[PDB]
Amino acid sequence: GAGSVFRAHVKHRKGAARLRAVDFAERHGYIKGIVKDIIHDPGRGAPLAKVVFRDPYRFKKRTELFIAAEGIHTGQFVYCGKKAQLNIGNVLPVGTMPEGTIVCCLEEKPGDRGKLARASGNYATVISHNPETKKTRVKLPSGSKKVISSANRAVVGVVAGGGRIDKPILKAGRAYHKYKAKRNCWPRVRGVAMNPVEHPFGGGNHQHIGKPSTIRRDAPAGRKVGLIAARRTGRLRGT
Amino acid sequence: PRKIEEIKDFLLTARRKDAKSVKIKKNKDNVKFKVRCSRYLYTLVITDKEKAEKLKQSLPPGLAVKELK
Amino acid sequence: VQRLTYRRRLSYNTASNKTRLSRTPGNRIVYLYTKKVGKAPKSACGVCPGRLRGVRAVRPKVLMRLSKTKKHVSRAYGGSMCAKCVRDRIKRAFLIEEQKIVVKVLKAQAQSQK
Amino acid sequence: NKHQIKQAVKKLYDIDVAKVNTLIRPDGEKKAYVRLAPDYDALDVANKIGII
Amino acid sequence: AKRTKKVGIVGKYGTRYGASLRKMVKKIEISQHAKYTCSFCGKTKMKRRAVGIWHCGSCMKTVAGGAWTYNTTSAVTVKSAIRRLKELKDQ
RNA sequence: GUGAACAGCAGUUGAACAUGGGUCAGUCGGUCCUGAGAGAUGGGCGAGCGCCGUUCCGAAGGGACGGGCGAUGGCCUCCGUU
RNA sequence: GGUAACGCGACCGAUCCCGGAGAAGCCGGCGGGAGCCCCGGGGAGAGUUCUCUUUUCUUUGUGAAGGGCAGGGCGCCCUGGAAUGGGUUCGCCCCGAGAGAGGGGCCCGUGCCUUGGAAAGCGUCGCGGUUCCGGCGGCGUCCGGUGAGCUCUCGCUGGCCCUUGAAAAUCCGGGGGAGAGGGUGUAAAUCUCGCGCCGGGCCGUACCCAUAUCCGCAGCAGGUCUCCAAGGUGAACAGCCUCUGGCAUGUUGGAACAAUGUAGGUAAGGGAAGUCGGCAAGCCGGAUCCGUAACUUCGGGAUAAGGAUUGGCUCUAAGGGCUGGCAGCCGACUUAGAACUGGUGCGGACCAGGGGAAUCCGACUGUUUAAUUAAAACAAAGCAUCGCGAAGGCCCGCGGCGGGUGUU
Ligand SMILES: [Zn+2]
C-alpha cells in the first residue's frame, strides 16, 4: 500500500490543539484566560477543552485548544506565563520549575507549539536541570533522556483518559466500528495465506515459514517485511 | 376576509375610493353585506331585517350594488 | 380508502417533504404543506438550558417579517440572556467591585505604612 | 421574451396585453397565449386582420 | 426476589467470551455504572458522558476526569506531588 | 382514413402506415450556497506537449462612514451626482 | 401596566464585538391530538319478500388567510418553610441550593365555530330548449357517546458509544453613544402599526414506470430506485374467503384418452433389512396444564427427555366512570366453574419442532472463487516481541523544503 486506502478518515475532527503563540507576555509576564467547556473530540481518544483569552492589542474574543488534564473542571481561571504560580493546569518555562515535575505537551524545540507527550495518559519527567547554557534532561515515556534547551513551555499535570487499554476488547462488533472510525486496515491477513506473487512470505503447499524472519536494515522495498533488525526475540526475561 | 362589527366602520369602508362592488347575500334570518376592497373582502352580518333594510337605503348611490341569489 | 398518488416530481421519502392531512371543501382528502418550524432561541449564557418564552419558535426567515416587540421582549438584554443570569452578573459585578474597593483600601494602607 | 411579445404586439397592432404565457412545442416552435382585455374582442381583432 | 446467583451486569452476555474475562470486566462496569458524588453539591448526579468527561445533573458543570473511573490513585499521587512541590517552593 | 409488411394461424384491432392537434407558472423544481472531490493562479520543476501544490518563497482590500476644495441637471436648495 | 414571567400600535440610532436558528446518532416505554374504521336512532336510492325478516348495502361537510375558546408542555416569578419525611411515574427522578397548599403568566394549538361558506358541490323528483344553457324549481347536506382497533404528528423520560453522530449562504437578537432635531407648536427628525400604487427575467411541464414503452440481438418466467394499503377469521404488514380497481390464460383451437415423460396425491402387511450414503420422500407439529437428567465457564441445557385436553346450545361468578361508610344513572373486554348434547367428534381446509447418546475439527454472528466445493478457509476475542523522539520508522515518486502516515 502507498495511499488513498489505508489513510485515517478525518471528517468530523476539525482542527488541532496547538500551544499559545510566544511573545513578551509569555517571556516576562503572565495573563489570565477562562475555561469555557470541555468536549470529547472525535478521532482523538483524549478530550479537548476551549480556553478563551483576549489579545492585548486587539479586541476579538480569542480561543485556544488544549489537551484536557485529569481532574479539571470548566468555568475556571487559568493563568499562563513565567511569573505564574504553581498549580494544576499552568503552562510555564522549564527553567523556572524545579526538578521532578510531571509535565505534558512538551516541545522538543522552542517554536513548534507542543509535540512531545500529549496522548491519552502520557507524561515526560524532568530528571535534572542545568543552569549554565540552559540545558535540561527530560526522560521520555520510552525511557530515553533527551536534552532540551529550556526555552520551551509546558503545562502541569497528566492527560485525562488514563487506563483506556487496560481492559481487553469485548467483541468484534465494537472492534469493527472502532477501527472503521480510526483507519481501514483492520482485516489483517497472514502473509502465508497471501499470494506469493505480491507478498514474499507466501507460497508453498503446506503452511510453513521455512526462512529466517530476521532481516538486515539495509533492504529495499518489498523485501522489508518482518522483525526489522531484531536483536532478541521471545519472552522478555527481567528488564 | 375580515368582519366589520359596527355600522360606522362599515360606512367609512363603503365611502372609500377603492370600493369596487358590494353584494348582498339574503339567507334566512340574516343579511350579509360584502364589500370588495383591495386587500380583504369585508363582511357585515346583520341579523335584524329592519336594520338591514334601513342600512340598504343607507348605502351611498356611488357603488355597484348587487343582490346575490 | 383514499389510495392517493403523487403531485410533485419528488418521489422518495425525503425529510424536506413534510405534509399534513386536511379535509377539502369538495369532500375529499389531500395533503397540505406544513411550514418549516424551528426551535426557540437559546440564551447566550450556556449554563441554563431553559429556552426563552415569548418568542415564536419558527424558521428565522419569518423574523424579517415580524415586528420589533414580536422579536424582542421589553426587558434589559432582551432575547439574548435570561434575567436570572443578568441579575447573577449584576451581583458578581457589585461583589467584585466592592472587593476591588477593599483591595484599593489595602493598597492605600500599604503605601501609608511602607 | 414574454415582455418582448407584449411590446411587439403593442407597437404593431396598438392593443393592450394582460399577460403572456408561452410554451415550446416538441416540433421546435414557441406557442404563446396572449390574454386580451375585454374592451377589444379577439374575434373582432381577428376579423379586422382578416383571418377566421 | 433473587435474580442471579453470582453474575451481574455481564449476565446479559451469557456463555460468551469466557468467565474470567467477564469477571475482570465486571469490576470496571460496576464502577462506571455507579455514579459518584460531586464536590460542589454532593448529590450523586455525576453521569458518564464519554471518555475523560463527566456531566453533573444538579450543578450542570462539566468535569474532565478519568476514562473509566472518576479519580484515580495515580491522580491522587499527582495531586500530592503538586502539594509537595508547592510546599517546597513556599519553604 | 388505409389495408404493402408485423402481432410465429388469425385480425375490421393494435405502440402497423399517412395527414393533422396536443405540454400555458411572480406562488411548481433548476437557478443562490457548500459537503466528499476537482481545479485556474503566486512560486518552483521540466528539452518538450506539460508537472507539484491549493497559500505553497508573493508589491493580495480598485471597497467604504465622515471633513475640505472647482464644476455641472432641477432658482447648485437637496439627493444618484462627478 | 405589574414584585414578576410578559403584553400593547409604530416607540431612533454607526464602526466594532458577542450569541442563536441554520445544524444534526440510534433504540425502548408512556401520554395527548387528528385521519381511516365500529355502533344506536333519523333521511334519499335500490335487492330479497312460496316462508319469515323494525332486513341488506351506497351516503351524510369544509381550504389557504386573521381572531377567540378548548387541550397540552412549563428547568417561569411571587405568599410561605417541609423528618414521625412529603407531592409523584407504565418505569423513575427531584426536595432548607427551597416539597406539597394558593394567585397570575407567556409557547404550540392542525380540535370547536365565526369572515371566507352555501352562492359552489353531492343525490331525489318534475318543467322545458328535439338542441345551444356553471338551466330552472321543492327536500336532505343529521342527531351522540365511545374503543390497549390501524396510520400520522407532537410532548415527556430513560438506555446504548473504547464509534459521539457534517459544512456553507442567510437573518434578526444584545451592550454601544460620534452624529443627525427643536423652542413651545400646524414643533423637527424618527417610523418594523393599519393601509394605497406598480412588477417579479430564463429553462421543463404530453405518455409508461412494466410477464407489450428501462436493460438484456426480441410482446424475454431474469435484474429492476420510491409513495398510498378495506371486512371477517387470527397475537400477526403470516395464510385463506369477500369490497374498490384491473383481467379475459399470456407464440394457437377441436377430438378421443395408447405406451412412455412432467407435477401431484391414495395405497392391505412388514418397516432402511436395497444402496457409499433414512439421499430423496414420510411422521411429529399450535395453545393450555403437570413436569424435567448427564456435564457445566452455573449464564445454557430446555420446547430436554416426557404425558392429559381441544365442538354446539343455555347459565353462574369476578374485575369500572358520573351525580348527590351511603343510593341512582351509564357500562367494554378478559378469565374460572357446571349440566344437557354431537356416529369419540373436535390446533376438523390454511399456518404447522424430529429427538436422545457418542468421535474429530473449528468457538460462534459475519466474508467467500459472478457460473461445479460453503466448508475444518478467512475475518477472529487473547498473547508474544522488532524499529523510531520529526536532523527520523515505513510507503509512493522522473522531478520542485514533493506527498501520505501527520488534524499525528
Ligand atoms: Zn455538585
Residue written as grid cell 506473487: A197
Give the burial string for D11-37 (b: 16+ CB within 10 Å, else e).
Answer: eeeeeebeebeeeeeeeeeeeeebeee
Residue written as grid cell 481518544: A45
Sheet with A145-148, side-by-side order of all strands: A92-93, A153-156, A102-104, A124-130, A135-139, A145-148
CB A159 within 8 A of CB A69: yes
Contacts of E43 (CB under 8 A, 6+ apart): E37, E57, E58
Pairing assessment for the beta strands A227-228 and A214-215 based on DSSP bridges: parallel
- The Cα–Cα gap between A157 and E81 comes to 10
What is the C81 CA–ligand 1 centroid distance (Å)?
Answer: 24
Contacts of A154 (CB under 8 A, 6+ apart): A91, A92, A94, A103, A104, A105, A106, A107, A114
Helix, strand, or coil here: A124? strand
Alpha-carbon torsion angle B46, B49, B50, B55, nearest 10:
40
Q: How many CA atoms lie within 13 A of A128 on its CB side?
A: 2
Query: H-helix or E-strand containing E64?
Result: strand E63-64
CB E52 within 8 A of CB A163: no
CB D22 within 8 A of CB D5: yes
- The Cα–Cα gap between A121 and A69 comes to 9
User: In whole angstroms, how far apart are CA E55 and each of A35, A140, E44, E64?
Assistant: 16, 33, 11, 9
Contacts of E32 (CB under 8 A, 6+ apart): E48, E68, E69
- The Cα–Cα gap between A53 and A28 comes to 18
Q: What is the DSSP letter of C42?
A: P
For Cα atoms A36, A40, A42, give the angle at the middle one, nearest 5 degrees: 130
Q: Which residues pair with A68 in a beta bridge?
A: none
Question: Does the nearest atom of strand G lie within 7 Å of A60's Cβ?
Answer: yes
Identity of the amino acid at A163: G
Contacts of B25 (CB under 8 A, 6+ apart): B31, B32, B34, B68
A65 CB within 8 Å of a chain E CB: no
A45 CB within 8 Å of a chain E CB: yes
E60 CB within 8 Å of a chain A CB: no
Q: What is the DSSP letter of A81?
A: E
How many other C-beta atoms can be found within 10 angstroms of the C-beta atom of residue E62?
23
Give the burial string for A58-88 (b: 16+ CB within 10 Å, else e).
Answer: eeeeeebebbbbbbbbbeeebbbbeebebeb
Name the residue among A46, A25, A56, A80 with its Cα closest to residue A162.
Answer: A46
Name the residue among B41, D20, A47 with its Cα closest to residue E54.
Answer: A47
Query: H-helix or E-strand containing B41?
Result: strand B41-46
Tell me chain A's radius of gyration from C-alpha atoms: 23
> Contact A47/E53, CB-based, under 8 Å?
yes
> Contact E68/A167, CB-based, under 8 Å?
yes
Residue A117 has which C-alpha cell? 507527550
E45 is in an annotated binding site: no
Q: What is the DSSP letter of A1?
A: -
**CA B66 from chain center: how many Å?**
10
Contacts of A211 (CB under 8 A, 6+ apart): A201
CB D25 within 8 A of CB D31: yes
Contacts of A138 (CB under 8 A, 6+ apart): A106, A124, A125, A126, A127, A145, A146, A148
Residue A16 has which C-alpha cell? 488541532
From chain A, pick out residues whose CB is under 8 angstroms from the CB of E17: 170-171
- The Cα–Cα gap between C74 and C55 comes to 12
Q: Looking at beta carbons, which pairs linking E70-75 to residues 24 or more positions away fall under 8 Å?
A: E70/E36, E70/E46, E71/A71, E72/A70, E72/A162, E72/A163, E74/A158, E74/A162, E75/A70, E75/A71, E75/A158, E75/A162
Question: What was the structure determination method?
Answer: cryo-EM
Name the residue among D10, D36, D43 with its Cα closest to residue D21.
Answer: D36
- Number of Cβ pairs < 8 A linking chain A and chain E: 106
Pairing assessment for the beta strands B21-27 and B2-3 based on DSSP bridges: unpaired
Q: Which resolution in angstroms does this entry have?
A: 3.2
Q: Which residues pair with B50 in a beta bridge?
A: none
Question: Does the nearest atom of strand F lie within 7 Å of D28's Cβ?
Answer: no
Question: What is the DSSP code string of chain D?
Answer: -HHHHHHHHHHHT---EEEEEEEE-TTS-EEEEEEEPTTS-HHHHHHHHS--
Residue written as grid cell 516576562: A28
Question: Does the nearest atom of strand G lie within 7 Å of E52's Cβ?
Answer: no
Identity of the amino acid at E9: I
User: In whole angstroms, how far apart are CA C88 and each of B13, C72, C91, D1?
Assistant: 54, 21, 5, 64
- The Cα–Cα gap between A46 and A119 comes to 7
Which residue precedes each gap in chain A (C to N above 2.5 Å)? none
Closest residue to G8 (CA, C1′): C69
